[PDB]
Symmetry: D2
Subunit: 483 residues, 4 copies
């Protein structure tokens, strides 16, 4: 039985309302989770607001101890996190294993950096003036998270936000409440001061909107669909609260003619399809140079044929799991259908059963396919063929999304001209598009959102600069002129 | 004096053919005809900027620095015509506009100086055979919308820095200070900056400004003005997911303790609170004095306010205080004084108002419910509040929706620091005026005073983004398919 | 108790088989049999570390961090052992060595924390189509030479940080504290650091330290000890152009003005000046007080000094002072005392000594010719000097060859800051002890107190170099041959 | 129209000895000027001028020094022509070279001015409660500036401009073979109106003026560019005062050409980098390493461009490719190198003709690592080409040298490019460009025998300033002794 965590106490919703949650894998019953109203949200927010000053003006080193204790506790709960991440989220073994490991590195990173967030000492154009800039935490920070990689993304947000001295109200993804409960578990066993961190499970339209519009929330960091992020930004405007938005993207994977082709294909398969393409930074549009295009397509398709779809609980070598739910399969079917009816050649896949969806691969697409124009969050992928670098770029940019991208090539000048030219918040040469480290500035441009997360960048999102001076000389003043 | 828009490097008329007659706040004499621009004007500016962008951001930092330096020496040759339009159109005193102009010079030069030194990072990778760096790139076309109180300095702070790192600019000045904006575009024109990199559109906020805020191809909006306007700009900015810098004004605490030179405390206070008729954003709008000095202080502060010389800012250089910007400001200060009286405040001096002129109105015996404790009082009405101890000083200081700046006078290091740490503001000054400002330092508030910081590299932080870039030098194995 | 060198992951004897007996400063009892090592041994360490170097430096930084974190765990289980040996060998009281072990834990943690985070820079280029970045690289095999007063914490501050950014380490601990060194190697070896990456050679400075300082393969030397020794080391280092970090100790001013709580100032001065028998590098070795509080301060300071409890540091936890490290320290403190009395100096208490235990000796009525003004007094003999104004308080504070730290006690913000500025020292502390030090802050002196800074990222700057790397993406024409 | 003299505490004056030496043109040997021969008295008066002016100078707001440097840039802009003329006549630079140098000095002075207000300290989290913990940048002091003759104007001005920007004052001893350039710098600074004592020019022999500078008590730091022997010794003597230094000691830089390059382009670039200013650049590409597959074509095409090099009087016109070496000693040296190479079995593919101070670039193949021109810095136009079988070997040769200064690789393979870039042991590296790339604001300097420290922009600033940790404690606490209380 899952509960909210508010002011250091595990409890019901005040509305008493409850909701059943079942696995995307077999549909079997998982847990009963709260479904919370504005009362619950309001309360969590308050608890955080009152914990805020105590939490922020204690020494950084101390918050860091807390975070290391959290690392401790996490290292003990790894098993349960892998388990829930598979059962609730439909992650494969190797996927959730990765998610857990990464999460560890994340928490650690926050602890590591807390003591080192630095203001600046400044030169003055005034004489006898001492002029510095301090870093201060924003306040209560709303944390709203996706369902695909819910442990790692949640923890990046939460750990880093806590480290530099903000408190946290955290409304997990609707489709992954158990994971969020487990995080709350972890935090509570770490023994953080009551109210410093709060879990509220519930509907976005209810909990989320209180979190986003409330007077006392200083900042919101969101990860989800671009519609939701957009309106969240609009509502955040009312209270002048600042936001960090990772809105997802359709990432170009450019492959040039000088590549080892086999490798390029394996890489593409891993990047475009891992976790069923349900990655925000998944490689959602494969752009390939004409000269290698036929061999590439052959080998890509070859390894896509090798992918094993199964119950992720079966064993460690299961490649692909379910989509998170029925809606996702609906939408993926739509994408495939649209693809065929527009004249696209289905090279493979397209079968679905329950929540599972075979990777579906298309060539012969134009820019008017929905799978070119939209974020396909799931395993349906285009392969576009381009005649030169100019064209590869032009395609890679033809999209509303700015999140990430990659290029495979051995030519340094091509690697760099392409990397410079592709409009993306992140770009990787000779690697997957979803490359992520804990301390690096993760984020998009264009429709993919605003802000960066990880390390000092997360700290930048949740803190502000305070210019402070001490003026050491007496001075004469211009008014009244009579003096 | 023929005033126009500046678009794609051309001085030109609005499409509307509209004109509007701008009058001086001083005597009401006609100053000049200025455009009233429509959406079509705005869109011409924005498109011009989007097209100039790639050209502008891909040239090396150092060339944009050249342009800024040219702009700077051009400015130096325009200084006194700037001063003139400042005194006449904005109603500033000689000493005010002189200061503003000098600081504008320091600003422009600062943007130029920093342009080449905005840096990214080289990071440790957690993976072997991986190079990991972070590049700085400029956003795009940047909206610049400015106030009338310090239009030269504020607009130039925004413009020059935003330009320096490679953004182009569409700029709509305060409706009451078009001519200053025109003089700016004149400067940028004599500067030689490429066609479409800077564009001036003089028009109504509701029409021009909003196209600037809501457009597809505008990247960012930096804004200084009323908090109402700030909130709604933020709102419509969310449409295109476009970021903003927001300076919304403040109600700035000025805290005076026992141990100060009460005379010096008073002089300082008069300067900070009333300079430019208290039309500075960071003006010391809420005066907090400790009871042990409060009587002497109040006496002495009032004495120095009585000595302020209010005249036509044109007549000579010694004039202390000139007019409020327009009728509505006088009507507002009247609302403020009327409110303070009927709430039982004691009005020590001032309140006389003739035309657009207002004698500074000083009030004591106020409480937290007076409109002038609860609102930004942009003008020369000021509260004095007496407090029993430092904790009351801070409590009171913090009782406000505003976060902008604040100050404390004291010779005691522990009180200076504990108060400075305790006071919720994004800027703070120990033993100086609240409105202290430098070229390169992070200017901005918290709470309802807005979001972001400006001047120097902080301006740079607002109008650029970070782009993580990696090269991978080892081929690897991947987890899927696991049959490999 | 039989102690060895640590070389290439293996504990071993000195080649020559030579040993010498380390005896306690308390009773002169035998503590341990330690090595007396020759060039062969030094070179064996240096070579072990040079061969380890590319391997250890090329791994991802996070892996080094793992090793430092492990080292943290081992040190945590070794806390007791280190404490014991710090008291027995170093003569530190329980409280002193407890503080040292806490700060050592924090230092190891600090290094681990910062390892992954030491950043290079991405630069703007003045050249078209040029990518320009700057990488950080580890210097090489780094010689680490440490003192006896705080050997655990000082050693580990140099060692841990140097190791974090990817240098390897050859380490010669103070002659008078071989065993804490041995214990350090025990810790490292239990952390399973790669063979060769850390090395411990125990032996005479003129032989081991010499070889370290002169050897072809040592990139850097970080040293803490006497200034004479410092100048020697610097000079030798020049031979192969290896860089140095030098902490040479200071004669530190602790300045007390008239507006302090004089009792507080007294307690703080007793702490600052005499803690660990003033055998701290950054101890307050010259007390400077304003005539207004001078007499009350001297009464009160001397009162608190009399209350100081001297005893065998192994007895209990409440012992205030232990013994000086060895006979010659006493010989020297006596020389100091005699030079003070003979110069017309007034001795307020102490000067007696028994075995290696020295009773704190306080002097007033001194002048700048006194040895205890002109030299570093490393031990519990302290001057108190009375000054008229802040001016001559500074004049006295700066009159010394040394640059390390300083402190001022006052509540006046203006005096605090003008004195803090005026004092020429690498560190300064307003209203706290002269020896205040944290893991991540730039600890170092100026003048004769040495060169460099240490702790955290500054330790990283000492043991790394910057490397500019460009990729030009354009092909250009060249000025020669012109005929083309 | 004017005599050459020292600049000390605001005044141009003769040496207290009144001594002089006649300095003559490396081109025709004709008289250029009488210049001072300064003694210790002169150096000590300079150092004392600077020490005296120091607190006045460091204390003013950085913006004011920025003004000074800006004015100095204005003055330089009107002295461009004069400078170019001297760099050609006194230092034997060709027109295109000195044009280059003067332009770069402009960028240098302007860069120092741009940065002076922007050199920042830090604000740290404290592990202690109620503590304000910050780090201030303070300037070091009087700074010794000792420069070479090869690029005397731009090197001097990097050191001088940046050192002044952050609040040091300066005592400047130029290279003996380029005193008139130093004098002209003094002229610039003087007309710029820097406070007396803030800048000082002393022209004398190194073993006297230079030594007093490096050994003196009041000098804080010494930035030196020049020979490694000289460098090492300055480090040594500097150590006695504990005075920090910046040593640019020269280097023999690898230019590695791989098989995937445009060989003709590689050749053109290699000619430029190896031979510009007759190979008298510190970062000159002094050891050319080429992959066997393209080695033949490269060697042919390299020699063909080198044969196209036009050597002449640098005053005849702007198209002159190479002018003279600085002095007779230098020709002598290049002869020593050539001689050694030949009798070690080297094949002399071209050049070696030497008339007066002029030297036709001598190019060798069939070289082994024992050749003097592999093992020592060759400052002048004698160059090795060494063929290697693969990237590993190329890196092995590139690294086999006592020097670390800079390096370059030509290739289009991003992996080979990077693996080599990171493999080569040097302070600087450039992919697909000449070894001697230098910008005003980037960290210029070597490792290994090539010296210590970095220069230009904030890096210069790090060299000539120190950090000062400063703290305010806002609470009182209890202390562990006496434990009785």
């Amino acid at each position: 039985k899952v509960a909210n965590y508010i002011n250091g106490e595990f409890k019901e919703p005040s509305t008493g309302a409850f909701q059943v949650k079942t696995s995307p894998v077999d549909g079997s019953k998982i847990a009963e989770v709260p479904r919370s109203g504005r009362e619950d949200a309001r309360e969590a927010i308050d608890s955080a607001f009152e914990a805020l000053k105590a939490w922020a003006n204690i020494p950084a080193i101390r918050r860091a101890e807390y975070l290391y204790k959290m690392l401790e506790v996490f290292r003990q709960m790894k098993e349960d996190f892998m388990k829930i991440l598979t059962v609730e989220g439909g992650g494969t073994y190797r996927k959730v294993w990765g998610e857990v490991v990464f999460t560890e590195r994340l928490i650690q990173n926050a602890a590591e950096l807390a003591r080192h967030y630095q203001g600046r000492v400044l030169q003055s154009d005034s004489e006898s003036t001492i002029s510095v800039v301090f870093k201060r935490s924003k306040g209560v920070v709303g944390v709203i998270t996706p369902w695909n990689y819910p442990l790692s993304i949640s923890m990046k947000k939460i750990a880093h936000t806590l480290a530099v001295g903000n408190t946290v109200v955290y409304k997990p993804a609707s489709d992954t409440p158990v994971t969020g409960w487990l995080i709350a578990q972890m935090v509570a066993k770490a023994g953080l001061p009551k109210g410093v961190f709060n879990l509220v499970i519930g509907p976005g339209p209810v909990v989320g909107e209180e979190i986003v519009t409330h007077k006392r929330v200083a900042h919101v960091t969101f990860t989800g669909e671009s519609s939701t992020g957009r309106e969240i930004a609009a509502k955040a405007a009312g209270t002048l609260k600042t936001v960090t938005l990772e809105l997802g993207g359709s990432d170009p994977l450019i492959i040039l003619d000088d590549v080892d082709v086999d490798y390029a294909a394996r890489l593409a398969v891993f990047a475009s399809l891992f976790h069923q393409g349900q990655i925000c930074t998944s490689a959602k549009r494969i752009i390939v140079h004409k000269a290698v295009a036929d061999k590439f397509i052959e080998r890509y398709v070859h390894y896509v044929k090798m992918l094993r779809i199964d119950d992720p609980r079966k064993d460690e070598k299961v490649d692909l799991g379910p989509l998170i739910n029925e809606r996702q399969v609906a939408l993926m079917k739509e994408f495939v259908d649209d693809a065929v009816s527009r004249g696209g050649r289905l090279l493979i896949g397209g079968r679905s059963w329950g929540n599972f969806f075979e990777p579906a691969i298309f060539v012969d697409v134009d820019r008017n396919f929905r799978i070119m124009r939209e974020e396909v969050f799931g395993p349906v992928r285009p392969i576009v063929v381009v005649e030169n670098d100019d064209q590869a770029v032009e395609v890679a940019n033809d999209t509303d999304y700015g999140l990430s991208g990659a290029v495979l090539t051995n030519n340094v000048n091509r690697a760099f001209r392409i990397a410079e030219a592709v409009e993306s918040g992140m770009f990787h040469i000779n690697d997957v598009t979803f490359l992520e480290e804990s301390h690096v500035p993760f984020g998009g441009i264009k429709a993919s959102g605003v802000g960066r997360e990880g390390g000092e960048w997360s700290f930048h999102e949740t803190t502000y600069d305070r210019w402070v001076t001490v003026t050491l000389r007496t001075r004469r003043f211009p008014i009244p002129s009579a003096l």
